[PDB]
Paper text:
Here, we describe detailed structural and functional analyses of one of these enzymes, the kanamycin-resistance methyltransferase from Catenulisporales acidiphilia (‘CacKam’). CacKam has a SAM-binding core fold comprised of a seven-stranded β-sheet with a central topological switch point, characteristic of Class I methyltransferases.
This complex structure revealed that the SAM-binding pocket is largely preformed in the apo protein. Binding of SAH to wild-type CacKam is accommodated by a small (∼1.5 Å) repositioning of the protein backbone encompassing the conserved GxGx(G) motif (38GTGDA42 in CacKam). The hydroxyl groups of the SAH ribose moiety form two hydrogen bonds with the highly conserved aspartic acid residue, D61, while the adenine base is bound in a hydrophobic pocket formed by residues L116, I93 and P62, and additionally positioned by a hydrogen bond between the adenine N6 and the side chain of CacKam residue E94. Conserved hydrophobic and hydrogen bonding interactions are made with the adenine base, ribose and homocysteine moiety of SAH.
Residue numbers in the entry: 9 to 230
Amino acid sequence: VLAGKKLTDLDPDEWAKAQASAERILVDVGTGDARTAYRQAIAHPEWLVVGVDPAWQRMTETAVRAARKPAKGGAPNLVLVSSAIETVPAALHGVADEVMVLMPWGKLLRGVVLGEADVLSGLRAVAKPGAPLEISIGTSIWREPIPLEIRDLPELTPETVVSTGLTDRLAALGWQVADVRLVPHTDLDTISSSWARRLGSGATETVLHLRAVAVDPRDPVG
Ligand SMILES: Nc1ncnc2c1ncn2[C@@H]1O[C@H](CSCC[C@H](N)C(=O)O)[C@@H](O)[C@H]1O
């Protein structure tokens, strides 16, 4: 089930032919209005870009522009799926060569910070063996006013990630942590994109980057 301005069923046969013709498959979890996923599709035509988000109405503006003709900015290799990651359909299982969570909010953000099974399993479910997971979080959300979904949780830092046992929880659910770091002055354009913000603005923010590799699950501490 996905979008073409309207909300329709996707032909399973069209799904296999698209994946097979793709040089690479990239799944973005939590795309907002999916301008980020759209820019990537344009920048890489040979990639099959898959944006997944429960708020499907939020990504209709992108769905319209991507539905246009190549001469007017159409992106045929863009697939915007209406779904939550904890209940991702079986058609998206193990199809991604790369999974990215960029500037998450709500259930996805809280699930990542806490290391909840439902979210982490869903993220792992869509990835192929060896696929990289890229989580990027702006650290300004731990400055008042702090969003409701995280205002009862201490700030997530490179040190906190291992102390709270997030490293071992990720590894147990199939994500082997490769790198955790803060990258200050990260240009917000390179991770975040909505049709409300113009490019080349120059807005920066300290970003918590978390990189992992899809491995076999059930791998806990002793
Ligand atoms: N459990 C969940 N699974 C998948 N997506 C979720 C989710 N909980 C929240 N989201 C989505 O994640 C989105 C974050 S807004 C971020 C948009 C984009 N990454 C950008 O930087 O521009 C929200 O629109 C919300 O709909």
